[PDB]
Amino acid sequence: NIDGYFKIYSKHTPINLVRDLPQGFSALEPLVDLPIGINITRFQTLLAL
């Protein structure tokens, strides 16, 4: 989030179970840009049960 613009990049790939953060390379293509213009200093996740 800079100059009043919020940017989001993403990249999805299947993974082989146990190993966490495998070796490899994958660039994150842009997804979403919004000109919200808001200060952000903290954030929190969400999850469904």
Binding site: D3, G4, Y5, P35, G37
Partner: protein
């Protein structure tokens, strides 16, 4: 102490001053936000070679 509320009597035979009018006020502001509510409609047909 008099009644604050009142209502116009809009019969069709009223004069132009008494004729009801619908007026819309279009207010514009710049509070230094990146928001934009306009857009151009100019696009000439492309040419090649």
């Amino acid at each position: 102490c008099y009644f604050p509320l009142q209502s116009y009597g809009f019969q069709p035979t009223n004069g132009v001053g008494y004729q009801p009018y619908r007026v819309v006020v279009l207010s514009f502001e710049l509070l230094h936000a990146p928001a934009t509510v306009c857009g151009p409609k100019k696009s000439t047909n492309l040419v090649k070679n």
